[PDB]
Amino acid sequence: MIPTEEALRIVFGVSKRLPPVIVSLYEALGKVLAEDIRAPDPLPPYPASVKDGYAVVASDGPGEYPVITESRAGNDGLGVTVTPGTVAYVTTGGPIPDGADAVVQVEDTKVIGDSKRVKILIQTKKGTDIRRVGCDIEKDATVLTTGERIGASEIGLLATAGVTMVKVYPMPIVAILSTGDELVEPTAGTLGRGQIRDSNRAMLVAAVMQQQCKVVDLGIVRDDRKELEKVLDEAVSSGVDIILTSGGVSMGDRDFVKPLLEEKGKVYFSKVLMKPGKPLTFAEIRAKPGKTVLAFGLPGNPVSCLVCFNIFVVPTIRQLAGWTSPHPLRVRLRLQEPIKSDPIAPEFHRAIIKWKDNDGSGTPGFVAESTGHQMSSRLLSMRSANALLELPATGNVLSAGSSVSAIIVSDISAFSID
Amino acid sequence: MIPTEEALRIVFGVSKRLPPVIVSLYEALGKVLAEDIRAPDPLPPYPASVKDGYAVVASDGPGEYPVITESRAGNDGLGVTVTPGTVAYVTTGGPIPDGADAVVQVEDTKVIGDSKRVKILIQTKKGTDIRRVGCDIEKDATVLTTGERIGASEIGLLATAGVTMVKVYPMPIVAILSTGDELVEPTAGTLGRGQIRDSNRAMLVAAVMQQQCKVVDLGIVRDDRKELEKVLDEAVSSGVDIILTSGGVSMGDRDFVKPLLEEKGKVYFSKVLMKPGKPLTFAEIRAKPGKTVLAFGLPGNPVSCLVCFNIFVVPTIRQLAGWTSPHPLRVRLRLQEPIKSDPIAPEFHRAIIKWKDNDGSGTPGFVAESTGHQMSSRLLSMRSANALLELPATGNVLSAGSSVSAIIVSDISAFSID
Ligand SMILES: Nc1ncnc2c1ncn2[C@@H]1O[C@H](COP(=O)(O)O)[C@@H](O)[C@H]1O
Ligand SMILES: Nc1ncnc2c1ncn2[C@@H]1O[C@H](COP(=O)(O)O)[C@@H](O)[C@H]1O
Ligand SMILES: [Mg+2]
Ligand SMILES: [Mg+2]
């Protein structure tokens, strides 16, 4: 039995970033860049107006002037020189004609006569409301770097730089199976004696889908050593990067996941000091030429299964996908109610957290409510839980208002407000 | 010109939740439930062992007993009665045979002889390590309610309850187009005079994809009133729920988005007191029978375009998708450097935030670094920005260490740690 901190260090040290691939612009969204991106031309590539108005010679000052050209885009005003005593109409983003050195916004002008004459109402300064060439992005500047995750603004920067095929780290492909003679499919209606619906598989498929990985659903496997070996061998040779099993890892006489992973590869650990999730097994299998496949023998209890996924599998998926910061967000928060910690193992207590203007202490902060009974068979304890409170193994009652560390397990930008 | 708080109230009051649909179990992930879900049978539906060990009559106490059956799943031990002086082998999740009232874990037992006899080493108590029928979920209990967002544990609860077709609120379908005679596709190589690559469209497509909505990409539209009217009429009749345009909303003589939205429907506002994002237009159009279509005339400047999407379009998508809490997460944080606020409009200053063990004041908390120059044409100011600092319109220099409100715009569970 090892502490969670050691089990995580072992998984981190074994897990390796996947080889990079080339994907299309929209396939790059959510992925980590595997190359730097440099601007092939400046932004703007021409001196551009910041305003709708008139391009002027700043030293002319207020007065009435003829409008000698109009510039909105492309070749508008090409070959025209704005000289002292003239002006040109411009729209925001329009190229500034040669000779003009400032822009006066349309609100500081007045059209005169029934042609093309305008009264400039202010004294402007050279460079006003003009974006010089390369103002926003210089030619050859690095706009994105290796190791940077691609979000909507990074997609915008790739499109600005004319990059439509991108080198990125791919997401791992994950195989998932359930084990047990007591399981039936979730489509089952009336249950026979000693049967339950398989809930872990669909839960894990959804959890892997939220991590943006492809899923290989290998179904229900019975408590038969030869049958489980065949499905594991088929998963290892299929090209997946991670295999997730659940169940078949306790102390029963038909629990074959641990001995099969010891036979096929290297089991680094099979027991972790934590509440819930004690029988977690982690192994590295080499596929026959070749490549490595990581295997997590997740506990069968629905709570322990999801908690082990959230703590151990999520950072592994991220490390394989090239994240330089794969750890989950940990924050400090105040308890809204008393919680008894466990005397033996540190507990990952499920909670519903929210940011409050007053966290109970007079300053704003996160607060947590327990999801109720924490029994590992009670999947209702995971319902709505956006965090796991890290309770040390003291056995004491942590009073309401005391502070604890919490791992945030669901989209902090999708948090329901107080 | 109206404040952002009013513009948001107007959008909220006009935006209506979409009609619910029936989807498959994995299509339900990320969606909001439009019906309550009740358990059709208890969990466990039979008295189940918590441990691998032996089912006993608690009052027998320590001693040597014959093993009369073995129970792991289904019909194992059906018709067998564990009487005083006997025991049954059980695995975790196995049905407890009739007559047995407690389980002694295998670590508190010893197999005796070369058949089927075991020594119970402890005095157990009635009910120990047994999950009674309905312990985790009672028959007919409500396990999920209308208005609840479906995550991995909620998928697990639907599978537990045997629900594979779910009534949910769908995501809106969003049409997106860019406007401008100066734009070229992002595939363009060498740019001609007065041209830039269209960056807003791919940025917005990515931003809508991150919100899990279907995208209708309507391409680049030129600064021609008849051409833009045709594309808007085609978008309105196509069945989309939201139309996003960018550009063509400033003070130029070829900016037709505002007058076209006034002609086609009801424009509620066209100017907002904010930095950046002043020319934001919002309208409601009725499609010819029928249904309503929401239109956002987003500003052309790349920064203003994305900031307006993050503040106004994200909560609208969420409201249409049935979220009861569509507002973004707002937190309080300390500045890592001084920032000058604007004297006229409240600014949405882009920042990179992280949670620190010491936020500078001695207590843990969020801290923020500015992304640098905030000019609305500088898309590099959005790069890596996971928050918008809400700076009031005071014109003062907010010193390093002072506290501000911040809107979190990117997955708080994907935050890079300190
Ligand atoms: N799709 C786009 N991508 C990048 N920049 C744009 C886009 N549309 C408009 N702009 C720029 O945003 C500014 C305002 O545009 P507009 O409101 O059309 O005058 C101008 O500098 C445009 O060149
Ligand atoms: N796929 C599954 N869905 C729901 N419960 C499960 C699943 N697999 C195992 N269990 C339960 O988890 C507990 C531990 O399983 P095991 O480790 O196989 O003994 C038992 O109560 C099982 O019935
Ligand atoms: Mg089992
Ligand atoms: Mg334009």
- Shortest alpha-carbon distance between residue B290 and chain A (Å): 32
Contact at 8 Å (CB) between A378 and B138? no
Tell whether B204 and B156 lie within a shared domain: no
Residue nearest to atom 7 of ligand 2 (CA): A300
Tell me the three state secondary structure of residue A263: helix
Which amino acid belongs to residue B242? I
Atom of ligand 1 nearest to the CA of B248: 18
Angle, nearest 10°, between helix axes A152-160 and B200-210? 160
Tell whether A151 and A12 lie within a shared domain: no
Q: Would strands B347-356 and B365-370 be described as parallel, antiparallel, or unpaired?
A: antiparallel
A75 chain-B contacts, CB cut-off 8 A:
192-194
| Burial degree of B123 (CB within 10 A; 0-12, 13-18, 19+) | exposed
Tell whether B201 and B298 lie within a shared domain: yes
Cβ of B29 and A155 within 8 Å? no
Catalogue the E-assigned strands of B336-402: 339-340, 347-356, 365-370, 387-391, 397-398
- Preceding peptide of B44 cis, ω within 30°: yes
Tell whether B50 and B31 lie within a shared domain: no
Question: How many Å apart are CA B183 and CA A254, to the nearest integer?
Answer: 66
Tell whether B272 and B175 lie within a shared domain: yes
Tell whether A338 and A367 lie within a shared domain: yes
Contact at 8 Å (CB) between B305 and B294? no
Question: How many Å apart are CA B198 and CA A301, to the nearest integer?
Answer: 51
> Which residue is listed with tokens 């595939």?
B187
Q: Would strands A117-120 and A63-71 be described as parallel, antiparallel, or unpaired?
A: antiparallel
First to last CA, chain B: 40
> Which residue is listed with tokens 């590539």?
A45
Tell whether A25 and A151 lie within a shared domain: yes
Closest residue by Cα to residue A322 from A21, A98, A72, A37: A21
Q: Tell me the C-alpha to C-alpha distance, in Å, between residue A406 and each of A59, A172, A331.
A: 62, 27, 5
> Which residue is listed with tokens 């609100």?
A107
Q: Would strands A165-169 and A142-144 be described as parallel, antiparallel, or unpaired?
A: unpaired
Angle, nearest 10°, between helix axes B257-264 and B225-237? 50
Question: How many Å apart are CA A13 and CA A235, to the nearest integer?
Answer: 23
Contact at 8 Å (CB) between A368 and A332? no
Among B313, B329, B345, give the residue marking a domain's end.
Answer: B329
DSSP single-letter state for residue A208: H
Sign of the C-alpha dihedral, residues B160, B164, B169, B171?
Answer: positive
Tell whether B342 and B361 lie within a shared domain: yes
- Assign residue A186 a region: left if phi > 0, alpha if psi is -120 to 50, beta otherwise? alpha
Tell whether A223 and A313 lie within a shared domain: yes
Considering only residues 256 to 295 of chain A, which have any Cβ-Cβ distance to chain B shorter than 8 Å? none
Tell whether B179 and B276 lie within a shared domain: yes
Question: How many Å apart are CA A338 and CA A359, to the nearest integer?
Answer: 15
Beta bridge partners of B70: B89
Which two tokens mark B70? 């073995």
Measured from the CB, is residue A180 less than 6 Å from ligand 2?
yes
A44 chain-B contacts, CB cut-off 8 A:
196, 377
For residue A110, how far is its CA from the centre of ligand 1 (angstroms)? Answer: 25
Domain CATH for A284? 3.40.980.10
Question: How many Å apart are CA A137 and CA A133, to the nearest integer?
Answer: 9
Domain CATH for A371? 2.40.340.10
B144-177 residues labelled b (16+ CB within 10 A) or e (exposed): bebebbbbbbbbbbbbbbbbbebbbbbbbbbbbb
Tell whether A261 and A276 lie within a shared domain: yes
Question: How many Å apart are CA A296 and CA A301, to the nearest integer?
Answer: 14
Question: How many Å apart are CA B207 and CA B204, to the nearest integer?
Answer: 5
Q: Hey, is the C-beta of B55 within 8 angstroms of any chain A C-beta?
A: no
DSSP H helices in A309-382: 314-320
Contact at 8 Å (CB) between B386 and B352? yes
Q: Tell me the C-alpha to C-alpha distance, in Å, between residue B413 and each of A335, A385, A415.
A: 20, 13, 10
Domain CATH for B35? 3.90.105.10
The domain total for chain A is: 4
Question: How many Å apart are CA B25 and CA B10, to the nearest integer?
Answer: 35
What is the signed CA dihedral for B258, B260, B262, B268, rounded to 10 degrees? -40
- Shortest alpha-carbon distance between residue A91 and chain B (Å): 5
Cβ of B378 and A136 within 8 Å? yes
Question: How many Å apart are CA B117 and CA B99, to the nearest integer?
Answer: 18
Closest residue by Cα to residue B45 from A178, A190, A302, A375: A190
Identify which ligand lies nearest to the alpha carbon of B136.
2
B143 chain-A contacts, CB cut-off 8 A:
380, 383
Contact at 8 Å (CB) between A388 and A349? yes
Question: How many Å apart are CA B179 and CA B243, to the nearest integer?
Answer: 13
Residue of A32, A92, A311, A314 for testing the chain B interface, max B β-carbons within 10 Å: A92
Which two tokens mark A192? 């026979």
Tell me the three state secondary structure of residue A310: helix
Tell whether B83 and B132 lie within a shared domain: yes
Instruction: Say how many C-beta atoms besides its own lie within 10 A of residue B226's C-beta.
Output: 7
Tell me the three state secondary structure of residue A148: coil
Question: How many Å apart are CA B254 and CA A43, to the nearest integer?
Answer: 23
Which two tokens mark B212? 């899990």
Contact at 8 Å (CB) between B157 and B144? yes
Q: Which of B154, B158, B380 sits opposite A137 (nearest CB)?
A: B380
DSSP string, B149-202: B--HHHHHHHHHTT--EEEEEPPPEEEEEEE-TTEE-TT--SPPTT-EE--HHH
B206 chain-A contacts, CB cut-off 8 A:
26, 29, 151-152, 155-156
DSSP H helices in B238-379: 257-264, 302-308, 314-320
Catalogue the E-assigned strands of B189-313: 196-197, 214-221, 242-246, 266-269, 272-273, 281-286, 292-298
Q: Hey, is the C-beta of B413 within 8 angstroms of any chain A C-beta?
A: yes
Closest residue by Cα to residue A144 from A170, A166, A128: A166
Among B307, B329, B351, give the residue marking a domain's end.
Answer: B329
Largest CA distance in chain A: 99
In the Cβ-directed half-sphere of B246, how many Cα atoms lie within 13 Å?
Answer: 28
- Preceding peptide of B315 cis, ω within 30°: no
**Which amino acids bring their CB within 6 angstroms of ligand 1?**
A 48, 91-93; B 178-180, 182-183, 196, 198-201, 246-250, 252, 300-302
Which two tokens mark A312? 């151990």
Among B300, B329, B358, give the residue marking a domain's end.
Answer: B329
Q: Hey, is the C-beta of B362 within 8 angstroms of any chain A C-beta?
A: no
- Shortest alpha-carbon distance between residue A236 and chain B (Å): 25
Question: How many Å apart are CA A3 and CA B381, to the nearest integer?
Answer: 42
Domain CATH for A67? 2.170.190.11
- Domain holding B360, by residue range, is 330-418
Q: Would strands A292-298 and A242-246 be described as parallel, antiparallel, or unpaired?
A: parallel
Q: Tell me the C-alpha to C-alpha distance, in Å, between residue B162 and each of A183, A202, B43, B144.
A: 12, 11, 12, 13
Question: How many Å apart are CA B244 and CA B317, to the nearest integer?
Answer: 12
Question: How many Å apart are CA B332 and CA B340, to the nearest integer?
Answer: 18
Q: Tell me the C-alpha to C-alpha distance, in Å, between residue A397 and each of A340, A374, A389.
A: 4, 15, 14
